[PDB]
Structure formats: structure tokens, C-alpha cells
Design brief:
This is part of a larger assembly, with four copies of chain A and two copies of chain B.
Chain A lengths: L3 E3 L6 E3 L1 E4 L3 H5 L2 H13 L4 E5 L6 H12 L8 E6 L13 H15 L4 E6 L8 H13 L3 E7 L3 H14 L6 E3 L8 H14 L2 E4 L28 H7 L2 H19 L4 H10 L4 E6 L4 H8 L1 H4 L5 H11 L6
Parallel strand pairs in A: 3-4, 3-10, 4-5, 5-6, 6-7, 7-8, 8-9, 9-10
Antiparallel strand pairs in A: 1-2
Helix pairs in contact in A: 2-11, 4-5, 5-6, 6-7, 9-13
Chain B lengths: L2 E6 L2 E6 H5 L9 H4 L3 E2 L4 E4 L3 H12 L12 H10 L4 H11 L1
Parallel strand pairs in B: 1-4
Antiparallel strand pairs in B: 1-2, 3-4
The complex binds NADP nicotinamide-adenine-dinucleotide phosphate (4 copies).
């Protein structure tokens, strides 16, 4: 219903859909396609773009930056986010140390050709860095105006709570968002744990891989299509997942879901994506797309949102049989 | 172990979260029940209640169940608090009998 | 609901503003009367008074009217405080009778 | 009596009269007229100039900046204020979010061709932004030296108190001023609520629209004069107010007040403006003016201030019949 | 004995003697003389130079800056201090408001052609500015690296204590020094009040006008010598003091002191100056000088310091008859 | 076993071995040799380089900086540290005063041609500077991004604890490391006192002079070899130590240790160095080297680390007879 919504309880407004750059920008697709994908997303209202120093070893950040600088869009109208953790082969180029967070974000900002990002995320937890150091660094880069806000990714509730806790302890800035995986086959965290952090400390959820890397699109029904992500070099892990006993069990479930899809008159993707936004707990879902078609199809999920009756949901819960117990 | 801060009318109490998990049905031990009194700005649970009584209410959890009424706290008052904090009818009676 | 902080000689008390609005004529319940003791630097009302007594003075509002004299506070002292905080002759007598 | 007075309890000294730029700068009047208006105000002692990113979609800020840069006045002798809230058509270009306050003020500062403003105001309250975020952003722009102080506008007492409260909670800087509407037909807030915040937390009042947009000048007695604000395109709302049942009731009251005006030997405007400053609760009144004549007339209100005896006031209270109950 | 000593309890080491620029730099004397005076002082070990935005309407600051830039001395070897309060004719160009402290110090720093000063002083108290605002501004300019430390001047003990108090309250930086008047005819404050603040909160005293503007030199015995400060245009106030009933009473006392002077084999000036440093309560005494001779004579006070036996002191106390009661 | 390890409990990862620049860079050895030494160390995994404003009166810092700028290594892959205390002949150019720490580090950073250092150390304690001033300055240079972290050197436990304590008191940044002397003939502090600070407040130890300035290499057995440090001009103090009654007692003990050395099939140096890392209490040991051979030999200590059985240790303890009582 509401296309834009507050990211968590922060004042930052984001579209319920955002466009990510993992695997595609500076990698799988071309710069012309990247440009096209972003322009489409932009003109269609999406103001959220997510990237990360690790994507295509910095290249994704370069491409995204170029597109922004080329289309000359107003910075105040974009919400750019980037993740930090893996920024190099050297010992000190990974982690959430004050040294890496500063150098890391600086490097990214340079690549993006931007003075700052709207939200910087810890790409994953760092057992080798004291929480205080990490929150102090995040709070530092924000005061230096290199970021507007910060957030976590792949952190447990306790970990997020620890961060929040430390911030209050030392009067630093708490995280405003957790970037978590969410799709019909990965629901536990977003559906059970995060809503509590949302109500308690206002942390919102920005979910990723709505189509479980393309899997929920059903295109892996008869196997590994040529030019699909599972086919790409360096993604054997994905291929392997798809062709596993568990992988197959899912695909099988897709067939059934597909039914509900045609019934409501929309593609399976649109169903899954809209399925992700069904609950106000999710502030925004990051989309992935290698084609302009894939993107436009996905954006359609919004129209599907009104049709998601409580019955339709219960039905999907049934076919999935994985509804987590609160 | 992750600690909690309970503010009772300005008087601050601190305990570990497992200490309160030792009695999952009580108000303070139940996440869903205490959630209503959490202050995000200060990271503490606030209760606009009787200060003298809470000393015992907290000791109850730390002691594993001992529920004694502070000598300086009236009987009718302390009873109300035991009720509010939802300590449970069992412990409730046990207190009653240990008290008369 | 907007909360207030009352500092009684270093001992900090906290309550919601409606809790004090429940007795608009008392000193703490009357904006114009308590205004004189507000500290803008700390955002709290300060009173250079008896610490032991205020426990009850605050409970009075939270309890809806109960005015008991703490067992450890002399009668002549606690009486002075009830007077200062301007609790009211009614509650004042009610205390008297409940006390002798 | 005292031409300059502390804005609230802050150390910032302002003239009791200031010149605003709403509707006129970069809009209704010309740059030559704007220049003339400011120079007059300046040479007559006024050091307070108010603007806002929203006025004439940034243009007011450009004109004001140009005049300052042209007259080469010493920055230390001007007190420039600007308001932030509506800075663009994009979702993220409005509100009191950290993102908008920073970008917003930056944009304004650029337009004004100034390194900072003396006071930055939240143009109105923002229900979608946590108070902590807002106070933290205000406090940030001040430490970055983009502003000397910050203030609120159109905020309720509770809201201002919340801001103050949060600042003390996190050791940030409290607001020093509230920019509120005040004229003979809008007295409640300034006369009842703000004096309390002034005594309690030192917040002062900088009032606007002393002539209720020209209405208290009486020029709308026989109707909508050509070239008057109510006549301007885009001000139907004003015209409508003027020609309403309530609008007329006021005008009628003006006639009577006019009497007291001639009696004290000054125009009705001067009476109303001086009426606004009668109480030390008001630190400064922002004037509006499309003519050099209108301005010089208005500045005259100061001479009228001594004649405002308690009787004269009670008399006006009578004819108005709207004295708010404390 | 110890030529350098900690300014208060701070880590800042200063010579017990410093050279000020009031009345002389950019005013009474010439730039060539100023240069000569500073070079002498420097080569003789003095690392403390005091000035103020108000001295010669900024000119003193220009001259001092030029000399520093010309002699190419290492910045790390100089301790420059400047005072802020009177920086202009405009309403907002005076006081201890955040606006003025920032603009004021910035202006001074520019004039001095320096990136920062070692210590910035509030030239006098400001009843129109909340202490919190002032301490916050001082603390700001230090974090911006425009000053190393800050201090007060002509503030009462209570006022200094209030500042210290507020700093601890909001975790800001307390003042480290009070620049107070001190000479044989002005002893109360430095001898009674400041030692308490020194022991309690570590605030040190940097005293000024050791020769009560030249008076303790005795040169006003027979009257107002030509080319003396009391003779200078704009110093009628000084002349008047010198030629007053009280003025004469002092001069008379000088004659007697002069005796003790010849007895210890040093000039009266050296006696008075050394008299100022007799107690470790005083960290440094700021000298004034219009001649290279006056300066070299004054510097001699140091040699006199060992001769100041408790008897010599008691003797001087007698002739003065103004020893303050603790 | 683990080549890289957290410096204390901070998130900063350092090699267990680092290369220092005392006596060699810009002094004893040549720039070509310095370059060679650093390149070797680098290519062999060492990311830690230590220097100090006092080394070769700034020259060491220049050489180290040049090498970094020449080899064009990525800054994010180096961990540079420098010590501050003795930076000049002037009174104010020494100590831990806010003035000196700022100016001092700035000077160093300039020499190194770096925007910041990873860790800045107080080279020794400063009895003339309040701890608060020092911690505030350290915390300042880190927020200014001139350093990532700070640490102490030659400070007593109580002193380090005081620093930590003050930081928590004023919500500043605590020290993360203490650079202490450690070798078979100097064990008390590192072996008894620091482990407590490590467990209690996470402060790690970065030890120096593993070969007691070359002494533990045994090369001083028959006397002072030509071109050895004890022979260098300005090191009579070292020569004297070596040729003292105590000096000889050590050398004598070396002979015995040498036995254990040949027994495990490694040089005495490698034994001593590896001996320093035997306990996880030590985060990194700073090496000293005038030859490329000396360096490569020393780096070999790592292979020796596995052979250090509890027996081998007890044996060494015996021959040394200086095991400190906890
Ligand atoms: N915070 C973290 O740790 C984290 C981790 C992972 C991702 N993320 C973020 O989340 C975003 C989510 O991206 P994702 O790749 O995971 O998303 P996804 O929705 O699971 O997968 C998108 C991929 O599936 C395919 N696809 C997309 N739409 C399709 C459609 N309508 N029909 C058929 N196939 C379609 C595309 O092409 P092919 O498969 O044909 O190439 C595309 O590459 C990323 O871009 C990144 O910004 C964050
Ligand atoms: N914080 C906020 O939300 C907020 C909101 C509104 C305004 N403000 C500020 O407050 C300032 C107040 O301005 P205002 O426009 O509201 O003021 P005002 O005093 O109510 O109205 C000024 C307008 O009335 C007319 N006028 C002025 N003097 C006159 C005179 N002597 N005789 C006859 N007509 C006269 C002028 O020309 P015409 O009518 O002939 O064109 C002028 O445009 C603004 O400039 C702005 O800076 C702030
Ligand atoms: N913080 C504040 O509010 C404040 C206020 C005042 C001053 N200060 C500072 O304190 C410093 C003290 O300066 P001051 O002028 O007050 O000092 P002072 O020692 O009282 O007087 C110095 C003046 O007396 C004369 N004189 C100096 N040495 C002499 C000697 N040996 N024999 C005869 N006459 C001699 C000089 O020439 P003539 O008299 O012949 O011209 C000189 O101008 C200033 O420069 C300023 O930096 C601070
Ligand atoms: N924080 C502080 O106060 C502090 C104080 C001192 C040092 N440090 C740091 O700690 C580092 C440690 O350096 P250091 O000089 O004390 O170390 P060291 O290991 O005690 O001595 C190194 C010196 O001994 C000789 N040497 C090195 N390896 C040798 C080998 N394998 N065989 C024979 N002789 C050998 C070298 O040449 P020659 O003897 O032949 O010239 C070299 O100059 C310094 O560079 C500095 O960064 C810090």
C-alpha cells in the first residue's frame, strides 16, 4: 500500500523495494545494462541502492558510482548503502576494526565518487573486534559525515542488542537496520527474531535474496539454464544447492506455489517478492536482476500486495510447511 | 551474561538476564510482558512504583525463590507488588504462610 | 508519558508527569509552584530536604492517596514535609488519624 | 525601550525587529527592491534576517545571499536564520531526518553563499522522525560549524520540551528559540504557552506574520486590492480567509482599533507590530514588506512602544475580545 | 629559581615572564621596535606572548603575527595567547556568545596568521551569556584545533568555579588559567582568592600590569613625563589616577620601596616584578614595555628573586600596609 | 603458531614480529639498506613498523615514510606506529601536554608523509601533565583521524590503569597497548604486571629490544666488535653496560643458553626472540636489525616457537635464574 516507508523507526524513508548490485554490477552484466537497470528502478520510484566493497572486488561500487554521476541525479533523492568487511587480501583489510571500517568506507566512498553513503553496514559479525571499537568507529564515520546512519548484517539478535546496548552505554549512535536474508525458504530470523528488536529498539529489517538467488523463480525446475547465476563461474556452491536433495524438495514446492501464482494472475517471482513485504516488519526488500525484463517483472510484485489475503497466506504456509514458531 | 537495568521510580536496579529467566512466567521474566515498560532511550525497564518493595522482588529471583517482605514495608502494599510483578500464586501463598 | 525527575538532596526520584497531575493543588502537582525548583542544566526539580521522607511523599501520588510515614522517619519531621509539599489538610488529617 | 535583546536566554543578541523573506525575495518583489529593503533594515539597526529553503524554491535564499555578498557587510554583524523541512520533490527531501537536515542546510548554505547560519530552524514538527535523530542532527550541524544555534517552529510546548529533554538525556544542544505565529488574531501560543518554556528552559520566541499577512493593515477593508498578497497567484487560501465570515469579523474589529491608532498618532500597522513587542516574552518580531514604504512605516512601531499604557492594552483587549486565559 | 613552570596544573609550560602587547604593538611603538622587543624576549627564553582582538583594534595581533612569520620561529616553541570580548561596533561583535567566541577567535587567528593559539581567554565576564554556552564554545574552538586551552580574565572565583562546574556537568573542558591584575597596589584577588582555585581545581594565575602601567616604576614622582603612557592620547584615565589623592599616596610609598631597591642593588621595577613571582601561586607575569631598555631591565627581575627573603617581604608589606587578610 | 594476532583485545591485527627503526633508520644504516630491510620484512608478512619523533631527530620517520611512498604499498596493509615525547629543544617541545601531543604527532605525520598512524604511543610517562589532559589529547588526535589508536610506553601498571580509568570517567578512548622492554634479562614487567592489565582491561604488550640491543646475540663475548651498536658514537652507555660486572654475568649465561640453541638447531638470537613470543601475553615483538642477514635470521625465530617445550623453558629459566615471582 505505502510505497515508501521508514527504515526501522529511523527518519530515513526508503522504497519498499530497492535494487542491489551483488553478482551483476561490474560482474555478470555490462555497464550499459547496469545503467539501464538503475535508470528503470529510479524512474519507477526506487531510491534504495545497495552495494559492498567486496562485490566484484570494488567494481560494483565503481559502476554504481558512474551511473549516479552520469545520470546527474540529485544526491538528496538517492539512498545509497554499502557494506564493509572484506576489503582486501592483507590481514588488516578485513573485519570490523576501527582501522578497517574507516579505511574501508573511505575506499568505497572514493570508488563511488561520493562524499558519503546513507547507511553503512557491517557485512557480517566480527568475533575479533570488541563491540565498543566497532560502534565507536561507526559513530565516527557518521560524525565525519561519511555516512548518515549505520546498520548490521547477518548479526544475531543478541549481537544487535549488544551493539545498541554499547551505544547507550557510551552515548554513541545505535544501528538502525539489520540486512537479513529472507525468502519463502529462509524465514526464521526475519519472522521471529527481528520483530522483537523492531519493537524494542526500533531496528528495521532490509532483507536480501527475495528469490533465493533466482531459485524461487522456478527456472531451475528442469535443471541449470545456460547464463543463469547457478551456471556462472564461481557459483558452484549455488548449483550444488539447487541440485541437492533439499534443493529439489523446494523446486517441487514451487510447482504448487506456481498454481497460486497463476490463480492471482501474476508470476511466481512477483508472488515471492510481494510475499516478503506482506508484513510491515520488513522495511524494504533488495531486488537482484540481470535483465531489464527481470527487473520490471519484479517491480510488479507491488500490485500483488493487495491480493495477499490472510487465506492466500495460510495456503502458502501449508504448501511450504516451514512457518516458524514464534 | 547480558545484563538488564530496572528503574523503579528513579532507583536503579541491575541484574543479569538469566537471573530473570529463572521464572519465565513472572512479569519481569516474560519478554512479552516486560516489553511494555522498556525505555529505548536509556536501555532500561521503568516502573512508576513502590521503591522499598522491589529490593525483595529482585532478591526473589537471585535467591532462587525466597520472598521475604522488607521489615519497613507494610503488608498490604508489598502484597500488591507481588501481585503486579506476577510472581505466581504458589510463591504468593508460600509468602503468606511464611508471614502468617 | 512525559516523565519527571525529582532530586532530593542527591537521591533521585522519577515519576510520570500525570502521576503528579493527579493532585493539582499540591506543590509538586502545581506547575507554577514547582517551577521555582527546576534545574535547567540537569532537567530535574531539586529539593534541599529530608531524603527518607520523600519515599512516601511520592508513593502518595502513585498510590492514589496513601500517606504512610516511613517507620524510620520521626513524626515531627515527616509532618513538616507533608506540610511543605503541600499535600492538603484533608490527606493531612487522614494521615494524623491513621497515625494516632 | 531596548532595541536589541537576547534571543531567549541564549547569548545571541537580536534586534526586536527582523526582516523576513517569505513571499517577497526571489518572488513577489524584485532583486533591486530586495536589496533596497535589506539595506534600509540594516542601516536602521536590524541585524535579523529570516529565510527558508522552501521560500521561492530556494530563490529567496539566493537573493538574500547576493545582497549580503554585494553590500559586503561584515558577517559578524548579521544574524541570518533559515528554516528546514521542505527541500524537494523526492521522498527523502522533506522532514527532519538526519539526512535531510544535513543535506538541507548544506544546500541552503550554498545558495546563501555562506559558511553557516546563526540559527537553523525545524520549519515544522516531523512525526516521522525520532526526536533523538533530529536533535542529534541539529547538534551535528552546529559542531560542524554550519550553524551557531538551532530552534523550532510551529512545535507544541510538549514537543519543544521533548527536544530539550532529549538533549539533556544525550548531552546534545537544546533548541534556543521557537518561531511562532503572533498577531492580534493569533495569541494563545505566544501568550500562554511559550512564557512557561521561556522561564523553565530559557527558550525564546521569534514571532512571524505580525500583520497577519497584511490583513491587520486594514487594506482589505473594501476588498482585495490589486497587487496585494491576497491577490497574488497561489494565495487563494489567503484571499479566501480574508473574504470569510471570520475574515470579515476581524476587519470590522480593525476599524475600531484604527481609532486607537489615530488617537496615539501612528498607523494601525505600527500599533499591531508594537503590540507584538509589548511583552518581554517576545524576543523579536519578523517583519514582511513588499515596499520600502511599508518597511519604514513598520519600523516606526518602535516609537509607539512607550505609548502602550496598561489602559491602551486593556482597551485593545476589549475590542478584540480574544484575550487567552492563562 | 625555575624559569619555566606549569601554567596552573595544566601540562602547558610557560616562562615565569611573558611579553604582552597592550598599548604598544600596532600602537604606541613601531613595528621595528615591536620586532626588536619580541626578538629580545624570545632569545632570552620567554615563550609567552599575550594579545587580544581589542588591542589597537586588531593591529596588535597583526604586528605580533608578522614578527612571528618573519623570524620564522618554530610554532611549537611559542605559547601565544589572545583574549576575546570586544571585537567590533556591531551588537553581535561583543560578548562571550558562541557566535562571538567563534567568529572572534577566527578573526584573531586570521590576523595573527596562525592556525591556532595556545590559550584563548574570555577577556572579561559576560552577564548576558549563559555559562553553558560559553564553556561549550570554548570547548568547541579547542576541538576544532583553533586553541589548545582556554582561560578566564577578570572573573570572580565563583564565576571561574561555575565554569569549571558546568564543564564537569556536561563533560566539556574546564578553564586552565585566570588572567588577573597583580602588582603591589592590587593584591587581594591573586593573593587571597586564586590560591584556593589553584589547589581545588588547578586553575593557575597569569597576572598583568606588574608595574601598574608604569606607575610602580616611580617615573611619575615629579609628574607626567613626556612620551609616557599617562601622557598618551586616550589615557586620561591613567593620568587622572596618577594625579589623584590615592595616586600620590602610592608614589610616596614608592620612595620608601626605592630604598629597599637600592639596598638589594636592583631597580624598583625589578623589585616589583620579582615581587610578583615571589609566590608559586603565580605561574607567569606579563610584562609591558615601550623600550628595549625597559624590557631588558624588567627581565632582570629574575636575578632579584633569590634575594627576596621573608624579612624583605615583611618589610615591603609594612611600607605598603595593604597585605590582604586571608 | 598464529603469525598474526590481536594487539591486546583491540581489533587491530599485527604480526607477532615487527620491524623497528631505532638507531638504524636515518642513522646507523643507509636509506638503501633501510629500504631493503623493510621490503624484506614486508614480503615476509610483517605489517608492523615502529618509529618515534625522537629517533635520529626525525630522520628515522623521514626514511620510513620514503620507503612507504616508494614501494607504493597499500596503506590499509601496513600498521605504522610512532612514539611521542621528545620532539625538540624548546621547553614546550617535550612531554605529554595537549600542545605537544598535537604538534608532535602532526610533525611526525608530516615527516612520514602519512595522513595518520595506526597507533600513537606516549614514549614515556609525564609527571608534569595531568592524565586527563593526556587522555583527552590522545582521544582528540584519534577523532581527528591522525591516529587509529593510542598506547603507552614505559608506564607502570598503575599509570596505565589511571589512563584507562580517566577514559571511562570522561568517556574518552582507553589505551590499547603498552610498549615494554622484554628479553631474557628484563622479564618482571611483561611477565608479572602486564598479564593482569591484559585480562582486566584488555591492554596488550608490544615488547622491544628482544636481543637487549644485540647483547643476547652473544657477539659481545670477547669484547666490543667494530661496527656494532656498542661501538657506535653516542652509545657509551651500552658499551659500559656490556663491560660491566653485571654485563659479564649475562654473557656468561649466554654461553650456556647457546648450548640449548645448537641443541634445537637454531641460532641464539632466534631462541631469545622466539622465547619472547612463547607466551600469548605478548602480542608482538619489535625487531632491530642493521643487516639484511640479521633480519632474516631473526625472522627464523618463528620456526623455533614449536620446539619450545615446557622443559626447554624450565631449563632456560634455570640457567637464567631470574624467573620473577608472580
Ligand atoms: N547483506 C548481505 O550479506 C547480502 C548478501 C547477499 C545479497 N545482499 C544484497 O541483496 C541483494 C539481493 O540480490 P539477490 O541476487 O540475492 O536477489 P534474488 O532476488 O534472490 O536473485 C536475483 C537473481 O535471480 C535472477 N532473477 C531476478 N529476477 C528474476 C525473474 N523475475 N525471473 C527469473 N530470474 C530472475 C537474476 O538473474 P540470473 O539468476 O539469471 O543471473 C538475478 O541475478 C543484492 O544485490 C545485495 O545488494 C546482501
Ligand atoms: N516559521 C514559519 O513557519 C514562518 C511562517 C510564515 C512566515 N515566517 C517568517 O516571518 C516573516 C513574517 O512575514 P509575513 O509576510 O508573515 O508578515 P506580515 O507582517 O504579516 O505581512 C507582510 C506583508 O503585508 C504587507 N504589508 C507590510 N507592511 C505593510 C504596511 N505597513 N501597510 C500595508 N501592508 C503592509 C506586505 O505587502 P503585500 O501584502 O501588499 O504584498 C507584506 O508582503 C516572513 O518573511 C518569514 O521570514 C515564518
Ligand atoms: N587580561 C586583561 O584584561 C589584561 C588587561 C591589561 C593588560 N593585560 C596584559 O598584560 C600585559 C601587561 O602590560 P602592562 O602595560 O599592564 O604592564 P606594566 O608592567 O604595568 O606597564 C608597562 C608600561 O610601563 C612602562 N615601563 C615598562 N618597564 C619599565 C621600566 N623598566 N621602567 C620605566 N617604565 C617602564 C612602559 O612604557 P611607557 O609607560 O613609558 O609607555 C610600558 O608601556 C599587557 O601587555 C597585556 O598583554 C591583560
Ligand atoms: N618504546 C620505547 O621506549 C622503545 C625503546 C627502545 C626500542 N623501541 C623499539 O623497539 C625496537 C627494538 O629494537 P632494538 O634495537 O632494541 O632491538 P634488539 O633486538 O635488542 O637489537 C637490534 C640490534 O642488535 C643487532 N642484531 C640484530 N639481529 C642480530 C642478529 N641476528 N645477530 C647479531 N646481532 C644482531 C643489530 O646490529 P648492531 O648491534 O650490529 O648495530 C641491531 O641494531 C626499536 O627499533 C624501536 O622501534 C622502543
Amino acid at each position: 500500500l505505502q510505497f515508501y516507508r521508514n527504515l526501522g523507526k529511523s527518519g530515513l524513508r526508503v522504497s519498499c523495494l530497492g535494487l542491489g548490485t551483488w553478482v551483476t554490477f561490474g560482474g555478470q552484466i555490462t555497464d550499459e545494462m547496469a545503467e539501464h537497470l538503475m535508470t528503470l528502478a529510479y524512474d519507477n520510484g526506487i531510491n534504495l541502492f545497495d552495494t559492498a566493497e567486496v562485490y566484484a572486488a570494488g567494481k560494483a561500487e565503481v559502476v554504481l558510482g558512474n551511473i549516479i554521476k552520469k545520470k546527474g541525479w540529485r544526491r538528496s533523492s538517492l539512498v545509497i548503502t554499502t557494506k564493509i568487511f572484506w576489503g582486501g587480501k592483507a590481514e588488516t583489510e578485513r573485519g570490523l576494526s576501527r582501522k578497517h571500517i574507516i579505511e574501508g568506507l573511505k575506499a568505497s566512498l572514493e570508488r563511488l565518487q561520493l562524499e558519503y553513503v546513507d547507511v553503512v553496514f557491517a557485512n557480517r559479525p566480527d568475533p575479533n573486534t570488541p563491540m565498543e571499537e566497532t560502534v565507536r568507529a561507526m559513530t565516527h564515520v557518521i560524525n565525519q559525515g561519511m555516512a548518515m546512519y549505520w546498520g548490521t548484517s547477518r548479526w544475531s539478535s543478541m549481537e544487535i542488542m549488544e551493539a545498541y546496548s554499547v551505544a547507550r552505554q557510551f552515548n554513541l549512535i545505535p544501528p538502525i537496520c539489520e540486512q537479513a536474508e529472507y525468502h519463502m525458504f529462509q524465514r526464521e530470523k526475519v519472522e521471529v527474531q527481528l520483530p522483537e528488536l523492531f519493537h524494542k529498539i526500533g531496528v528495521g529489517a532490509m532483507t536480501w535474496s527475495p528469490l533465493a538467488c533466482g531459485i524461487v523463480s522456478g527456472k531451475y525446475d528442469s535443471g541449470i539454464p545456460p547464463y543463469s547465476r547457478a551456471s556462472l563461474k564461481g557459483y558452484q556452491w549455488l548449483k550444488d544447492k539447487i541440485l541437492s536433495e533439499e534443493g529439489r524438495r523446494q523446486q517441487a514446492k514451487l510447482k504448487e506455489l506456481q498454481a497460486i501464482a497463476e490463480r492471482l494472475g501474476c508470476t511466481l517471482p512477483q508472488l515471492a517478492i510481494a510475499w516478503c513485504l506482506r508484513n510491515e516488519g520488513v522495511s524494504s526488500v533488495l531486488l537482484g536482476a540481470s535483465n531489464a525484463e527481470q527487473l520490471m517483472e519484479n517491480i510488479g510484485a507491488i500490485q500483488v500486495l493487495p491480493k495477499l489475503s490472510s487465506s492466500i497466506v495460510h495456503e502458502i504456509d501449508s504448501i511450504l510447511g516451514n512457518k516458524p514458531y514464534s | 551474561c547480558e545484563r538488564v537495568v530496572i528503574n523503579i521510580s528513579g532507583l536503579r536496579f541491575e541484574t543479569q538476564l538469566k537471573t530473570l529467566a529463572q521464572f519465565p512466567e513472572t512479569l519481569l521474566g516474560d519478554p512479552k510482558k516486560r516489553m511494555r515498560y522498556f525505555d529505548p532511550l536509556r536501555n532500561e525497564y521503568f516502573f512508576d512504583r513502590n521503591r522499598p518493595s522491589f529490593d525483595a522482588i529482585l532478591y526473589y529471583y537471585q535467591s532462587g525463590g525466597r520472598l521475604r517482605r522488607p521489615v519497613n514495608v507494610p503488608l498490604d502494599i508489598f502484597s500488591e507488588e507481588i501481585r503486579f510483578y506476577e510472581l505466581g500464586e504458589e510463591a504468593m501463598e508460600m509468602f503468606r504462610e511464611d508471614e502468617g
